[PDB]
């Protein structure tokens, strides 16, 4: 009769057909990613085309119901989730222009080689043959050559394309009652309708600057330690007061400092125990790795794995005849179907990847009671933060000594703890300033605070003052350095990696205080604890039916990002850095330059 | 010994939809519920009004055997005093229901790799079904306040939908064959006694 009953019937008729069309496309995508041939790639196209056509046809009609006479929150949330047409607000021609512009940057980033000032018959592309120079090569005049040649060849043609990509995306978002495209990406954290749990959009800015301003001393100490450790291999190219060069890090862009461990190590005589040489002398398999991971989740209060999982999942590489994309993923086909595609080897890195991949299955298996529009995570950082604590718990020496992998003779030591905390330091704390700086630059560019003739003028001073990284060679206003990243040449939000880290430690501290633990945070696990693990299942049952500020309150108790489990996780490391950074200068100045 | 008319409703070859459930009459025979153990591993023999634990020695004047097919997550709706989609639009049981329900998984027979679009159910209806009522109409369900004129446009949908079973679904979506026996106790000579 009224708008409420009409909307209820409309949503029922939608959910009836949507959950059957969204199954054939996912099944075709699975069959293609597992048995890629000349026919599966063509069969995967029509299913997705029909699904997209149905989705647009249903979203174009789900707009006559005014969202003003709706008093129930569930129907209102489903209508709000169905009213986001995305890029369907642009015109007919502008759509094709934006489609052909985005593909050009993608094929430019995919292809493209580099030439050296030496004999030029060696043409290197982004194939792992090139990034090895930026990962394991220590000799100078090669890392700098590669770093300059990358932004020299493929960085020049991405400038005339990004200038139109910015103005085109600013018009697509202007039709969705937004301000710009930077405000469009910030809308995922918009939670409306609650008693006190209301979260505004713009607050997302004020909550990040307040958060990054608290990990500045720890990052400064780590940066000073890395700078002092790098002066033993490059004595004449590093200044003990200035910043670090843009190259010479452990990555092509400096996003992850993980490749600096063989150089920046506290104690080199320590073995850094590995359980890889423990399944050879006793006998393991790819099924035993996924069986010891299932036993982990049933000792906490989580359901078993369905019979269709062990029969339809690809847990190893095929023998012959087939070919796979070789990427561990967890597929939620729908209709009660859950699979995992991952080529598993008998190692330690694959033993911890099974837990991270099953952390997504236990999340998908748990919100399946939602009307097909609330079957997601709270926000973009909630889904990937659940799989991180499962790998954090399964890597402790306590969990490895309770399954038969580590003998009951070696307990712990103060040196291996520091060796482990530093390797984890240059994987989490080393990427937060980079992520913050990149997202801030992209937001200011999409807004308008940075003119078109000031991009590579404010891109580098921020990297000098925020990240503490200087450029080796000057870059005039014809380059495009951020566009060299994969997440910038293709439309991808980069802030999802900043919050996911914080949520990673807010969940771990709240789930380790429900198992009666008193030691260090980096030594606790949620195994054999039903209480610590039943509070998590309460949050993993809402999807996006409730505001993310309320689902976070059910597991940790707080309504916002309050990051000081991270300062408690790296407590034995932050105290060891202050004892070493004594006869040095903690900090940098944005005035020095190598050349 | 005139044995029961069973072995023709259980071991059938073609079941019926839930919105057009089949009904069979049983009279002038001998009830022999002692061979149902050889059937599927089914975990549903749920009886109300009578006792199943070795209390099959009563005499009835008539027996009504209904049969249909549903999904695995709706077998809980075939019970006295229940709500949902099937219980309100397809098959309703009274609160004084004397008799019982059996449900067994039929994934190996009623599922297809391309989708079993044969079985149907009812999704929309103006009102709920009376106990043991049945509707087979295919009229356009007018939701709004404008006429439909026989065409299904906006706020005017078709009331019948399909199941599309597949062997890769979960246990909550795999097909289940359901048989409901109801016992009548009239003032007539009870000719259905059983050993
Ligand atoms: C159906 O077939 C099975 C097969 O063993 C048999 O035992 C049973 O008596 C038959 N009839 C019924 C009603 O189950
Ligand atoms: Zn993951």
Describe the structure.
The complex is a heterodimer of chains A (595) and B (195). Chain A is mostly helical. Among the domains of chain A are: 1-84; 276-412 and 497-569, no CATH class. Chain A has helices spanning 3-34, 40-61, 73-82, 92-110, 128-131, 143-153, 159-174, 181-185, 203-212, 216-230, 286-298, 307-312, 348-364, 382-394, 397-400, 414-428, 432-447, 455-467, 486-489, 496-512, 534-539, 548-555, 566-569, 571-580; strands at 244-245, 329-334, 337-341, 469-470. In chain A, the strands form two sheets. In chain A, strands 1-4 form a two-stranded parallel sheet. Chain A has a two-stranded antiparallel sheet with strand order 2-3. The longest helix of chain A is centred in the first third of the chain and has 32 residues, at 3-34. Chain B is mainly beta. Chain B folds into two domains: 1-114 and 167-195, no CATH class; 115-166, no CATH class. In chain B, 4% of the residues lie in helices and 24% in strands. Chain B is built from two helices and nine strands; from the N terminus they run βββαβαβββββ. A five-stranded antiparallel sheet of chain B has the order 1-3-9-4-2. A two-stranded antiparallel sheet of chain B has the order 5-8. At the A-B interface, helix 1 and helix 12 of A face loops of B. Bound molecules: 2-acetamido-2-deoxy-beta-D-glucopyranose and zinc ion. 2-acetamido-2-deoxy-beta-D-glucopyranose (NAG) binds next to loops of chain B. Chain A: GO terms for molecular function: carboxypeptidase activity; endopeptidase activity; identical protein binding; metal ion binding; metallocarboxypeptidase activity; peptidyl-dipeptidase activity; transporter activator activity; virus receptor activity. Chain A: Zn(2+) binds at residues 356, 360, 384. Chain A: Substrate binds at residues 255, 327-328, 497.
């Amino acid at each position: 009769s009224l708008t409420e009953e009409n909307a209820k019937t409309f949503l029922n008729n939608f959910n009836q057909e949507a959950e059957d069309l969204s199954y054939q496309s996912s099944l075709a995508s699975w069959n293609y990613n597992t048995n890629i041939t000349e026919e599966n790639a063509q069969k995967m196209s029509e299913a997705a085309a029909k699904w997209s056509a149905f989705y647009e046809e249903q979203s174009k009609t789900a707009q006559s119901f005014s969202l003003q006479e709706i008093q129930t929150p569930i129907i209102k949330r489903q209508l709000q989730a169905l009213q986001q047409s995305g890029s369907s607000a642009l015109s007919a021609d502008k759509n094709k222009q934006l489609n052909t512009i985005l593909n050009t940057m993608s094929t430019i980033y995919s292809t493209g080689k580099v030439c050296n000032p030496k004999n030029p018959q060696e043409c290197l592309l982004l194939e792992p043959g090139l990034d090895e120079i930026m990962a394991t090569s220590t000799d100078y005049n090669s890392r700098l050559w590669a770093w300059e040649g990358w932004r020299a060849e493929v960085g020049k043609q991405l400038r005339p394309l990004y200038e139109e990509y910015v103005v085109l995306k600013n018009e697509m978002a202007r039709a969705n009652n937004y301000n710009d495209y930077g405000d469009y990406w910030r809308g995922d954290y918009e939670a409306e309708g609650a008693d006190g749990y209301n979260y505004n959009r713009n607050q997302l800015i004020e909550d990040v600057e307040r958060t990054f301003a608290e990990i500045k001393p720890l990052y400064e100490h780590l940066h000073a330690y890395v700078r002092r450790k790098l002066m033993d291999t490059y004595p004449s190219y590093i200044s003990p007061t200035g910043c670090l060069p843009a190259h010479l890090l452990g990555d092509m862009w400096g996003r992850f400092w993980t490749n600096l461990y063989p150089l920046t190590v506290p104690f080199a005589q320590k073995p850094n125990i590995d359980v890889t040489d423990a399944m050879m002398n006793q006998g393991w398999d790819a099924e035993r790795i996924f069986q010891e991971a299932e036993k982990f989740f049933v000792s906490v209060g989580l359901p078993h794995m369905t019979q269709g999982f062990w029969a339809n999942s690809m847990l190893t590489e095929p023998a012959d005849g087939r070919k796979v994309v070789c990427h561990p993923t967890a597929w939620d086909l729908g209709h009660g179907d859950f699979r995992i595609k991952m080529c598993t080897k008998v190692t330690m890195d694959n033993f911890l990847t099974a837990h991270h991949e099953m952390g997504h299955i236990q999340y998908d298996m748990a919100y399946a009671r939602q009307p097909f529009l609330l079957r997601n995570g709270a926000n973009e950082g909630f889904h990937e933060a659940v799989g991180e604590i499962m790998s954090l718990s399964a890597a402790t020496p306590k969990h490895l000594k309770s399954i038969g992998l580590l003998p009951s003779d070696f307990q712990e030591d103060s040196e291996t703890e520091i060796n482990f905390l530093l390797k984890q330091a240059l994987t989490i704390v080393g990427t937060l300033p980079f992520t913050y700086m990149l997202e801030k630059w992209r937001w200011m560019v999409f807004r308008g605070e940075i003119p078109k003739e000031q991009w590579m003028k404010k891109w580098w001073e921020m990297k000098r003052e925020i990240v503490g990284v200087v450029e080796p060679l000057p870059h005039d206003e014809t380059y495009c350095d951020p566009a060299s990243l994969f997440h910038v040449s293709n439309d991808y939000s980069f802030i999802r990696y900043y919050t996911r880290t914080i949520y990673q430690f807010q969940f771990q501290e709240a789930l380790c205080q429900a198992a009666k633990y008193n030691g260090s945070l980096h030594k606790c696990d949620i195994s054999n604890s039903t209480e610590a693990g039943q509070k998590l299942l309460k949050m993993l049952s809402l999807g996006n039916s409730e505001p993310w500020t309320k689902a976070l309150e059910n597991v940790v108790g707080a309504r916002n990002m309050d990051v000081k489990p991270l300062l408690n996780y790296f407590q034995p490391l932050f105290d060891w850095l202050k004892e070493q950074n004594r006869n040095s200068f903690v900090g940098w100045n944005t005035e020095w330059s190598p050349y | 010994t005139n044995l029961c008319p069973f072995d023709e409703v259980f071991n059938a070859t073609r079941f019926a939809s839930v919105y057009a459930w089949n009904r069979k009459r049983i009279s002038n025979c001998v009830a022999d519920y002692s061979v149902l153990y050889n059937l599927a591993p089914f975990f549903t023999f749920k009886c109300y009004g009578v006792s199943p634990t070795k209390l099959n020695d009563l005499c009835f004047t008539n027996v009504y055997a209904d049969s249909f097919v549903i999904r695995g997550d709706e077998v809980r709706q075939i019970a006295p005093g229940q709500t949902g989609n099937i219980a309100d639009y397809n098959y309703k049981l009274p609160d004084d229901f004397t008799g019982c329900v059996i449900a067994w998984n039929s994934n190996k027979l009623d599922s297809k790799v391309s989708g079993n679009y044969n079985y149907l159910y009812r999704l929309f209806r103006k009102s709920n079904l009376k106990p043991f009522e049945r509707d087979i109409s295919t009229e356009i369900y007018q939701a709004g306040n404008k006429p439909c004129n026989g065409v299904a446009g906006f706020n005017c949908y078709f009331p019948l939908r399909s199941y599309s079973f597949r062997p890769t679904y979960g246990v909550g979506h795999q097909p289940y064959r359901v048989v409901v026996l109801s016992f009548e106790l009239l003032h007539a000579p009870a000719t259905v006694c059983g050993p």
